[PDB]
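PROTEIN DATA CARD
Card holder: gamma1-adaptin
Chain length: 120
Origin: Homo sapiens
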Amino acid sequence: GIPSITAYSKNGLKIEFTFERSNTNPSVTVITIQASNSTELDMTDFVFQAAVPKTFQLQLLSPSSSIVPAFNTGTITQVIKVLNPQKQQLRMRIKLTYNHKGSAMQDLAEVNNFPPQSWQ
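Structure generated from the sequence above:
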């Protein structure tokens, strides 16, 4: 199967990606993200956004919640579907925003570690 990865891990927020290829469409890969929080305080109003190259199409489904609970007591699950009509090297930039420790947090990051099976 397609290997799962940690797409992002910083400031106590961890985002894992698991992948599933469409059986009907060689160009569709379903990514399930799981956001977890290893700190002592909740991360609230959490929003995950992503962008892919122009030849690709991206669909984001609703996240399970907007709170990444403290102490790793649960996760936020969200499904993204990537259409890769030309079977090109998968690339993605993600933007994270949330409130934590009294601050408005934001980060923008490239996902650098997609496995070949996620697009080939």
